[PDB]
Amino acid sequence: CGIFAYLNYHVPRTRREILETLIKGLQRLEYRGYDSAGVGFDGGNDKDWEANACKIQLIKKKGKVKALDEEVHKQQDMDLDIEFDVHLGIAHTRWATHGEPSPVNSHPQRSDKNNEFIVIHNGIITNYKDLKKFLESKGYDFESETDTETIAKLVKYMYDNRESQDTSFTTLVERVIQQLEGAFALVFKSVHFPGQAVGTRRGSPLLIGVRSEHKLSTDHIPILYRDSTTCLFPVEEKAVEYYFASDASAVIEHTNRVIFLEDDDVAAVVDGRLSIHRRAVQTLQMELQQIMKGNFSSFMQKEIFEQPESVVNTMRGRVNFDDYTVNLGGLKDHIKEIQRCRRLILIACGTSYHAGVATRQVLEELTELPVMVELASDFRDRNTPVFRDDVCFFLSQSGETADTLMGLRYCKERGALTVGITNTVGSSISRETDCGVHINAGPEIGVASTKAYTSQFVSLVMFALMMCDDRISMQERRKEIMLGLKRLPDLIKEVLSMDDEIQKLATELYHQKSVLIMGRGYHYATCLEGALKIKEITYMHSEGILAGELKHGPLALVDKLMPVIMIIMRDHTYAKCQNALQQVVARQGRPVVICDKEDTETIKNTKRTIKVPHSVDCLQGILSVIPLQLLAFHLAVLRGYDVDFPRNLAKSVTVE
Amino acid sequence: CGIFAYLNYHVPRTRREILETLIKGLQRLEYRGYDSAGVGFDGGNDKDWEANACKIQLIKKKGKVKALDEEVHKQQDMDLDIEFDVHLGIAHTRWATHGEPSPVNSHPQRSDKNNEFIVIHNGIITNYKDLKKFLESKGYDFESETDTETIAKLVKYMYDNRESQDTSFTTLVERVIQQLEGAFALVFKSVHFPGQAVGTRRGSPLLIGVRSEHKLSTDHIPILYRVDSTTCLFPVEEKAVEYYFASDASAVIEHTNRVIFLEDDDVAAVVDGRLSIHRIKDHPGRAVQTLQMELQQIMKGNFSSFMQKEIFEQPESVVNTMRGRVNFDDYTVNLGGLKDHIKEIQRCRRLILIACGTSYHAGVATRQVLEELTELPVMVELASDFRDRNTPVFRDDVCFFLSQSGETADTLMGLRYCKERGALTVGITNTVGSSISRETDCGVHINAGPEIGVASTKAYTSQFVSLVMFALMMCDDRISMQERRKEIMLGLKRLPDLIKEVLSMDDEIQKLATELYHQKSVLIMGRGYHYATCLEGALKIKEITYMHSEGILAGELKHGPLALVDKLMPVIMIIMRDHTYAKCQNALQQVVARQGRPVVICDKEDTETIKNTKRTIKVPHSVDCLQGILSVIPLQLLAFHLAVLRGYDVDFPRNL
Ligand SMILES: O=C[C@H](O)[C@@H](O)[C@H](O)[C@H](O)COP(=O)(O)O
Ligand SMILES: O=C[C@H](O)[C@@H](O)[C@H](O)[C@H](O)COP(=O)(O)O
Ligand SMILES: N[C@@H](CCC(=O)O)C(=O)O
């Protein structure tokens, strides 16, 4: 789900300039949820913009944002020419995990048939059923099945029972959040408070961007508790443009000056002045180019072919190849205490969990500690034992995944040392961990993680290299690995140069219903992540099978018709991988083998081979997964699917 | 693959009776799979059995044992009425590895055209190439492509080059095995040692059954290192005795339940009707022990298949697993196999469960209750991956090895890995005498009865119960857990009848089987206590039905796999009444929202889901940590019925 609102205070914008700004903001957030969308602006057709703030218009439609962008336009009642000196517009894209993504269930919600209060919500209210029965008895009629409607029908209830004729919009919102349980990020708009917006959060992101050619009155808004030296506003004049949003990608295009709110911070823009109730106006360290497709037809394709660069960025300022030293600044004050601990636990979901499987072996090798890799959802169901001398890693590209974040607080309660491996600065997981590392792979827009996986991979390897930098016996092993990392970017380029060869094989498989991907050792993770990618964007039934497990049942599924992909690399499991290949062939399987270029034996005896360059055994997983990223991509194109917006989900599961 | 030899010593038997005994022995060994069988016995039709001991007749044939029996009685030049006071007959079922199936490549292999030496072999001789070259240079011509023939030719080489005219049959075999490499179980017969038998093994099971109406000299055979009445097994006051060599107790139990399990490099010899055990390496020996196995346990009975029998007898096998171990009269659990080690186990700091296939699923299915009741970390490992990674193991680790057969290579090698690192090892097995039950410090025999079916059915649920019972032992001193222990044990008390209740819904499962008859994929979704149910049910349907069933952790849906859901993909969901019930309902709403129409396995009294879901398999409620047994049985049956509908033989391996 995404939030975006545009408040232009004394900056004349026509009704078209505002709508094209709300739509453009949702496009920046569409990857967080594209099942439905909606906008909320002022209606009426009066030249004097003052006589129009009493009429709220809601345009909501099922589908992606492009379905809403067309619904907004070509309307017979809205005149897109009205100049507004002051105006507020709120927008929202929804990830409909439940029920149908109907316009009635999309946001902004309303509080009545006249739109006196409209709210956009990101999160879940854990007691909306109680709030629904209380509001129904007082005389409020509910229309939608969502939990957001109980927030709109309630802000009006606090308005219908106030004490003074002019209670601030903050007071109303403050009484609402006190009756709301769970997490939420809200942005209000009302006809009673024209131009005023109220943005409160609790367990969900919500920042406020600001732009103005004039000087700002301060850079540290003082949080208040229920004047000219308290609010953020232009000094001499009134020209200012605010940008409420749940992410920074929707605001960077307009300005890089935002104010990240905090839990229970009730921001309020009144008379064009931003004030917080119950901060720091800062510069974003992001360039627009980072969230642009460039010359690629899709974000996912860009993010795959940019892995040579993102790998370099992950190691930048951390790996020195002249003296073979590794230093992760985020762990300098804790590395000593980590080494005195007795166990590593890696906790994550989906592709981030695979990154742990991909590096478990080398972590065991170089730390000599037990390494346990856990799926966050299952980790929580079982109340896994955790102790004070456990070091718990939490791998999360977004840094907001629910099950991973709750697992973190579970481990903190038991006194464990917590470490965050994130791709998002200021995220919940990066803040609430004792320490952490920012993989610094750049923004990931494609729903299917690609560079985030390889960057997590490299990051966990760098940690392993630190944990053994005092072992004489492991010095040569460290050198081998670091020389591999030095050569890794160019080898990734070599893999990407086989893009057309991968595309050809894709034309041989796109019609199939299933594909089994088999590997072991360092490439168990490879066959799991490759199977997940193909599931996610192609919708083929791909499954990863541990090669050593074939003989124990799954091999019965292999015949001449069942597609099979095998991974056979020149590491210590080569002979065993060859035995698995022989078993597949005996069952009449005709598999595609991802192997090393020098593996002449495999290349001669196998028709379809993807020949990747050889790297260090504990790094080869990075090179062996990329062909499967590309394969998943091409298969999706052949089948007529979008690689950036796979069906039935969105990016980052921030609510469970 | 299957070995059987019958030695009647001063127990008169006709040639017919001997041949019928050999055939019957192989019939008990067919369930392992094979492609050819043969027998070796004394030829000649001289009415005096003593003059026929110099003519070894062979009858080998490609095909099933039934065809062999027809060839036996189809011999015009053979008189079946000759009575042998002393005679040795050997039989074999072959699973070809070296040399295609054929009469010549079948066992017994002979040393020359006169059959001076014959041998039956289970396994593979690795250095059979080098050995064949050597014997050919010495003037021995080979007639088969089997590695086994080198054994028959080599024993004649030692005989031909013996130093004295009276070198023992044992000495010859000792010199043969000292030149062999690989795995083998062997039974030798020769004209130069009439009436004598020599058995030896290395990495392959070989046991000896014994029967006599007279008292035996001992129940503990002492090892003889490189003779008289005080050193071997024999009937005391008279000569009559019968010996049964076999690679599987199933071929012996109908004649006797007193068996000797040989160990690696043992050379067991019967000379003058007396059994001695030799070795080349407080006094070691081999015990004559009693098996509680019965012939009825390895017979289909009234069932049409072993799979059907072993599924539907699970009420009885669960009861047998608990017999003598659970006392519902006073809420106590006592696994006798752990008496001398339960103290040390409770002082250890981590549990590691190591297994393959369905046995690994048994660990996943009990991980949570083990964590809960032991409060120790519990790590569940796939044996093949456990080996590849050189997983850290410590002296204070308790390592469990789950294995129905007790011989699975990766599981067995994992055991020896942990033993080297000083871990306390525990075997959870279902086969007496197996390697894993021997080499572990202690163990528990799940006592499910022999598993003859190709797929693990009762073994899985008996492993499940066995690990729950161990968990109940580990917390028997905790006041805070008394109630929980009582709840679990009253569930075990009621479990047999609840299984019967699930088996009474077989008709409902058949209806589901016809609905999936034409389907190529099915997703089985669950979490918590039923994660294992999803993985195990998915494996059964893969192994038995040959369709692409996959287990998906419900909590992982929104992280990618949910993209497979639509109106066409068959889905089975598990929703039981435990603490994850609300999260399972969430997963169901996520599937339905994407046009999925899943079949739900739920509690009988879950009225909400039964009304909102078309087809539901309604199982009875048990304790949360025991429901996995009830929820997996409908999936066992589903795989069974789908296979029958598609014309498959559920008792036929496939996995070759
Ligand atoms: O390709 C799949 C996605 O990348 C997905 O599996 C993702 O990994 C999780 O939904 C959470 O990821 P983060 O917690 O790292 O944001
Ligand atoms: O239906 C599944 C099979 O039974 C298979 O997965 C089996 O579990 C393994 O081959 C391990 O066998 P053991 O239990 O003998 O180690
Ligand atoms: N390797 C031997 C015996 C195989 C077996 O049956 O175990 C052969 O192929 O003849």
Numbering used by the authors:
A (entry chain B): 2 to 227, 242 to 293, 304 to 681
B (entry chain A): 2 to 227, 241 to 295, 300 to 674
Sentences from the paper on this structure:
HP activity is regulated by its first and rate-limiting enzyme glutamine fructose-6-phosphate amidotransferase (GFAT, EC 2.6.1.16). GFAT is a modular enzyme composed of a glutaminase domain responsible for hydrolysis of l-Gln into l-glutamate (l-Glu) and an isomerase/transferase domain that catalyzes the isomerization of Frc6P to glucose-6-phosphate (Glc6P) as well as the transfer of ammonia to Glc6P to build glucosamine-6-phosphate (GlcN6P). The relative orientation of the two domains with their respective active sites is relevant for catalysis and affected by substrate binding. GFAT-1 activity is modulated by UDP-GlcNAc feedback inhibition and via phosphorylation by protein kinase A (PKA).
The well-conserved C-tail (C-terminal residues 670–681) is the major mobile element between the isomerase and glutaminase domain of GFAT. To independently test whether thermal shift assays can indeed indicate domain interactions, we generated the C-tail lock mutant L405R of human GFAT-1 and characterized it structurally, as well as in thermal shift assays and in kinetic measurements. Miszkiel and Wojciechowski showed in molecular dynamic simulations that the C-tail lock mutation, which introduces a salt-bridge similar as observed in E. coli, limits the C-tail’s flexibility. We solved the crystal structure (resolution 2.38 Å) and confirmed that the L405R substitution indeed formed a salt-bridge with the C-terminal Glu681 and additionally interacted with Asp428. The kinetics (l-Gln and Frc6P) and the UDP-GlcNAc inhibition remained unaffected by the C-tail lock mutation. Importantly, the L405R mutant clearly showed a single melting point at 56.9 ± 0.1 °C in thermal shift assays, indicating a changed stability of both domains, which can only be explained by the altered interactions between them. Therefore, thermal shift assays are a valid tool to analyze domain interactions of GFAT-1.
